[PDB]
């Protein structure tokens, strides 16, 4: 178990997708929902930028 001093996500930060079809891909948190414990991260793709929503823990900080 490795606890982190900071456990809050914000917009503008970059995180790696850990769950979903983009798992294992660089993404940037665009919208976060602490009220519902949900997080949103936009993904950039060659002329295919598509926003994806995820839950806390589904992303790893770099």
Swiss-Prot record:
It comes from the Bacteria. Signal peptide: none annotated. Participates in transcription elongation, termination and antitermination. Belongs to the NusG family. This is Transcription termination/antitermination protein NusG. It comes from Mycobacterium tuberculosis (strain CDC 1551 / Oshkosh). The chain holds residues 178 to 238 of 238 of the full protein.
